[PDB]
RNA sequence: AGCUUUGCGCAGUGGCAGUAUCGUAGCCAAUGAGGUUUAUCCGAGGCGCGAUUAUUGCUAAUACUUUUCCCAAUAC
């Protein structure tokens, strides 16, 4: 259903991002700055300093291709 | 036929700051740089290296003596 999008980022990540976007057609009309935020959770900070790694991160950030880099 | 807007040049008159200005046959960048806030939101340069009075040129301040003239009879 999506060869290239699966090639870039696995299979679970692509499935989750189009499921949250609403299909390939709905995801195509979306800019990159919003695809970067597919799956961003509110992540209430309990004393900490927005060091929660999910202030503006979604399924793309937690994909293994991005997670296999130094944290900075 | 004046009035007026935008961008770009050439100037003139000012004001402001020298912890900043410039370079980039180096790299990356609207096929997306960078994202601290307004993130299903914003939207351009950034990094490394190099020059330097933290841009670069001038102008001025830090001294007076060479010469070149000389003595003599109305006499054995």
Swiss-Prot record:
Mutagenesis / variant outcome for changing residue 2 to P: In RP11; mislocation of the protein in the cytoplasm, but no effect on interaction with PRPF6; the result may be a deficiency in splicing function in the retina
Modification after translation, per record: Phosphorylated by PRP4K during spliceosome assembly.
Included stretch of the parent chain: 215 to 286 of 499
Tissue: Ubiquitously expressed.
Site (Interaction with U4 snRNA and U4atac snRNA): 56
Site (Interaction with U4 snRNA): 33
Nop domain ranges (all copies): 1-72
Connected disease: Retinitis pigmentosa 11: A retinal dystrophy belonging to the group of pigmentary retinopathies. Retinitis pigmentosa is characterized by retinal pigment deposits visible on fundus examination and primary loss of rod photoreceptor cells followed by secondary loss of cone photoreceptors. Patients typically have night vision blindness and loss of midperipheral visual field. As their condition progresses, they lose their far peripheral visual field and eventually central vision as well.
Function: Involved in pre-mRNA splicing as component of the spliceosome. Required for the assembly of the U4/U5/U6 tri-snRNP complex, one of the building blocks of the spliceosome.
Subunit structure as annotated in this protein's UniProt entry: Identified in the spliceosome B complex. Component of the U4/U6-U5 tri-snRNP complex composed of the U4, U6 and U5 snRNAs and at least PRPF3, PRPF4, PRPF6, PRPF8, PRPF31, SNRNP200, TXNL4A, SNRNP40, DDX23, CD2BP2, PPIH, SNU13, EFTUD2, SART1 and USP39. Interacts with a complex formed by SNU13 and U4 snRNA, but not with SNU13 or U4 snRNA alone. The complex formed by SNU13 and PRPF31 also binds U4atac snRNA, a characteristic component of specific, less abundant spliceosomal complexes. Interacts with PRPF6/U5 snRNP-associated 102 kDa protein.
Compartments it resides in: Nucleus; Nucleus speckle; Nucleus, Cajal body
Protein name: U4/U6 small nuclear ribonucleoprotein Prp31
Domains (record comment): Interacts with the snRNP via the Nop domain. The coiled coil domain is formed by two non-contiguous helices.
Family note: Belongs to the PRP31 family.
